[PDB]
RNA sequence: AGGAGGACACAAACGGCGCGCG
């Protein structure tokens, strides 16, 4: 996933929030998961290419 | 003798300057 966020693990700081209602949770895993984002919207490329 | 009477509630903010990190 780090290639996703272009995340270097070199001090890096990242932010959590919490989806309550019962709706935001469903989006979340309809539509935010990470296994639903294998492609990348820009063009026919994998985000999960190899690190 | 008889007889008569008699207090509930209530938890810290806004603008600069500087530095630093992603």
């Given at each position: 996933?780090?290639?996703?966020?272009?995340?270097?693990?070199?001090?890096?700081?990242?932010?959590?929030?919490?989806?309550?209602?019962?709706?935001?949770?469903?989006?979340?895993r309809?539509?935010?998961?990470?296994?639903?984002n294998?492609?990348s919207?820009?063009?026919?490329?994998?985000?999960?290419?190899?690190?």
């Open positions: 996933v780090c290639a996703a966020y272009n995340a270097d693990f070199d001090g890096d700081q990242m932010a959590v929030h919490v989806p309550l209602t019962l709706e935001a949770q469903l989006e979340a309809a539509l935010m998961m990470s296994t639903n294998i492609l919207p820009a063009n026919g490329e994998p985000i999960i290419v190899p690190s």
